[PDB]
Design a protein around this ligand. Structure first.
Ligand SMILES: Nc1ncnc2c1ncn2[C@@H]1O[C@H](COP(=O)(O)OP(=O)(O)NP(=O)(O)O)[C@@H](O)[C@H]1O
Ligand SMILES: [Mg+2]
Length: 378
């Protein structure tokens, strides 16, 4: 009875398993522990994850992402109508429900959001079975704490379509606290703040744990703020640099911009552990190579307003929970963007020097807690 914990994120998806007293965050056959939440359709095949993401510039109208923003919602929902303006793929109305419309093997096909996510879940299932050498059926799947019943049910249906037996849908911030064993600290009630900065979204949650029971006191954040905005600032920075050096604008070459974006995302990650990072792109535009660098200070300066602004949802969450910052017992970092040293410094300063829970890889913390929960329930 091996059950997995699955964090289905807006930008990336993670799968873990708790075995013999340790959580393994499962890497795929190329050694990558993360699967982009991307699905693509071509003349001949359906691509999932990095295979789909890697060809997005060549096949933009048939490469689907952000299905988590659509799942469980209705077509006339203002959220859906606003987000549709930013996607290169078609979203159509089927009897009040949104469907993504694509060309696939020469035919027009449409998929519900939970069908798109089930394809990502199918890959997660195969990744875990590749690692475990066994059939994997039971799963705990996480969702943001603000998801309503429709979004929870549709996320569960995505698991069911993938052949998974979803033991339970649990909140992402609750999974994070479970990962740190915060419900097992026997004592008085604990106020826990989860600071979740991902690729596309920023979620602040305050939970209270009394006698080991989780209760969501408040939620705040920004559904369109994440690591991708910081990448955007880098891309604009290097587009201006390239124009300054070569008097040429690469903006309208989708492949060039995509290759610059990929380099920028990778450089950003390096700047979390190094004070400088190199950009190396052969023949970026009209045969010209782009070899340059960026310091951590410049990356921080390019994003200073976005970084500082993450504290306003923290203040709002505390206001709604009717708690002073000093009443928070544990601060938990979640999401890949919280590895940014400036974000950690801003949040720890905000809490008057209080140490942050961050020893679990923040982009893995939700899948870690989901995997523990899956073992408890199976
Ligand atoms: N070491 C790092 N330093 C800085 N950013 C990082 C690092 N590792 C990952 N990221 C960024 O973290 C983001 C992805 O975080 P992750 O938590 O894995 O996505 P997610 O779970 O899909 N969250 P979300 O998109 O908000 O639903 C991307 O923008 C990455 O570039
Ligand atoms: Mg996540």
């Amino acid at each position: 009875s091996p059950a997995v914990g699955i964090d289905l994120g807006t930008t990336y998806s993670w799968v873990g398993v708790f075995q013999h007293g340790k959580v393994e965050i499962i890497a795929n056959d190329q050694g990558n522990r993360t699967t982009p939440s991307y699905v693509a359709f071509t003349d001949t095949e359906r691509l999932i994850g990095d295979a789909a993401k890697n060809q997005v510039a060549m096949n933009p109208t048939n490469t689907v992402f952000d299905a988590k923003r659509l799942i469980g919602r209705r077509f006339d929902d203002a959220v859906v109508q606003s987000d549709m303006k930013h996607w290169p793929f078609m979203v159509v109305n089927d009897a009040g429900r949104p469907k993504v419309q694509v060309e696939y093997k020469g035919e027009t096909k449409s998929f519900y959001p939970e069908e798109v996510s089930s394809m990502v879940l199918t890959k997660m299932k195969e990744i875990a079975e590749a690692y475990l050498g066994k059939t994997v059926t039971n799963a705990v799947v996480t969702v943001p704490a603000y998801f309503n019943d429709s979004q929870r049910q549709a996320t569960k249906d995505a698991g069911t379509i993938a052949g998974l037996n979803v033991l339970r849908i649990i909140n992402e911030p609750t999974a994070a606290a479970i990962a740190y064993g915060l419900d097992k600290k026997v004592g008085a009630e604990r106020n826990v703040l989860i600071f979740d900065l991902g690729g596309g979204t920023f979620d602040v949650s305050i939970l209270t744990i009394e006698d080991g029971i989780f209760e969501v006191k408040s939620t705040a954040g920004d559904t369109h703020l994440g690591g991708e905005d910081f990448d955007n600032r880098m891309v604009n920075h290097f587009i201006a640099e390239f124009k300054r050096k070569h008097k040429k604008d690469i903006s309208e070459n989708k492949r060039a911009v995509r290759r610059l974006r990929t380099a920028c995302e990778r450089a950003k990650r390096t700047l979390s552990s190094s004070t400088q990072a190199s950009i190396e792109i052969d023949s970026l535009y009209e045969g010209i190579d782009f070899y340059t660098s960026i310091t951590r200070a410049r990356f921080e300066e390019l994003n200073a307003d976005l970084f500082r602004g993450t504290l306003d949802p923290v203040e709002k969450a505390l206001r709604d929970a009717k708690l002073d910052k000093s009443q928070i017992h544990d601060i938990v970092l979640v999401g890949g963007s919280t590895r940014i040293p400036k974000i950690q410094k801003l949040l720890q300063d905000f809490f008057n020097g209080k140490e942050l829970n961050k020893s679990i890889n923040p982009d893995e913390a939700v899948a870690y807690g989901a995997a523990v929960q899956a073992a408890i329930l199976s």
